[PDB]
Design a protein around this ligand. Structure first.
Ligand SMILES: [Zn+2]
Lengths: 199, 140
């Protein structure tokens, strides 16, 4: 328990009382938004894991925040449609390729966008659209498709492009697993029905 | 995972020894095997798969073979690693058909004395790596 009293109060209010969060997050130099427990979840992550749209919007109002991608993934894994809408409305997704391309290869990923508690992430190759297809959330798949998120079809098994060889050289198991994940997303009835004409 | 493997073996031995509560001990050993198989199933990187398949030389695979933990050895995460060593130093031959493999067996049968006598220099040659792969040993 290395967290201070004020941040602990703010975090427990976010997990459970909108007025307390509103008072703590307004006109206060302290109580950093992207603070989390020693081994717990972020304020945004706690506000998204338990359905509360207004607290999530208040948390996302801050320009600088962390674990936005993990919050989106956790919301998508369940039927939290409005939370997903609010998170996608954040300018971070609109002004970046974070929405479309996978966390593993989106960028140099210096910032912890999709990062989980300490080191892990779901697999790094699973995009929000692929996760929505896996869980078969028709509304979420439709929303992500309207935002431009499409599952990229994996190359042929005998592909000889530079990227395929580079992924095959190191961690061929991860390459096979990511291919299976992409095909699981593509073969999803939700993605099949909502993604193309003549499905 | 090592604790669960050892406990599974111990519970199987107890099931053999008792014969009264054999079903109880067999159910417990199945619980241990299921735990090991699930922990292996969670792996999503080569580093994790290797760490599970051998501890801190496929040690855990050999232990599971010894302890008849059949679902752990037959899991795809273990099978892909086993095929990696199996088809070592020969990548294209993995994708060949069964008929091509039979033709390779026939060629090896015809030329076994020649490669055997050439083995005196093969370790210094490239063909030594080819013949020293486990698949080529099995074919020989
Ligand atoms: Zn390719």
């Amino acid at each position: 328990t290395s967290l201070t009293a004020e941040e602990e109060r703010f975090l427990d209010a976010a997990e459970y009382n909108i007025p307390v969060v509103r008072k703590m997050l307004e006109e206060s130099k302290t109580l950093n938004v992207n603070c989390v427990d020693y081994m717990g979840q972020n304020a945004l992550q706690l506000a998204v894991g338990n359905e509360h749209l207004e607290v999530t919007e208040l948390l996302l109002k801050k320009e600088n925040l962390a674990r936005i991608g993990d919050a989106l993934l956790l919301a998508i894994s369940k039927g939290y449609v409005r939370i997903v809408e609010a998170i996608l409305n954040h300018p971070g997704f609109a002004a970046s390729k974070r929405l479309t391309l996978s966390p593993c290869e989106q960028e140099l990923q210096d910032d912890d966008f999709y990062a989980y508690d300490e080191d892990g992430t779901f697999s790094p190759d699973i995009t929000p659209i692929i996760l929505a297809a896996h869980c078969q959330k028709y509304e979420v798949v439709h929303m992500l498709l309207m935002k431009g998120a499409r599952i990229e079809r994996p190359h042929d098994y005998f592909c000889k492009c530079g990227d395929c060889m580079e992924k095959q050289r190191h961690d061929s198991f991860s390459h096979s697993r990511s291919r299976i994940n992409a095909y699981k997303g593509l073969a999803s009835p939700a993605y099949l029905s909502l993604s193309s004409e003549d499905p | 995972v090592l604790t669960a493997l050892e406990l599974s073996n111990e519970l199987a031995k107890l099931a053999n020894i008792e014969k009264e509560f054999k079903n109880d001990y067999r159910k417990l050993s199945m619980q241990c095997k299921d735990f090991v198989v699930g922990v292996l199933d969670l792996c999503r990187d080569s580093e994790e798969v290797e760490a599970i398949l051998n501890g801190d030389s496929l040690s855990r695979v050999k232990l599971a073979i010894k302890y008849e933990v059949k679902k752990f050895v037959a899991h795809p995460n273990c099978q892909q690693q086993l095929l990696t060593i199996w088809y070592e130093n020969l990548s294209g031959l993995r994708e060949q058909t069964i008929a091509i493999k039979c033709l390779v067996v026939l060629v090896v049968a015809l030329g076994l004395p020649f490669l055997a006598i050439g083995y005196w220099i093969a370790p210094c040659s490239r063909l030594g790596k080819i013949l020293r792969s486990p698949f080529m040993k099995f074919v020989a």
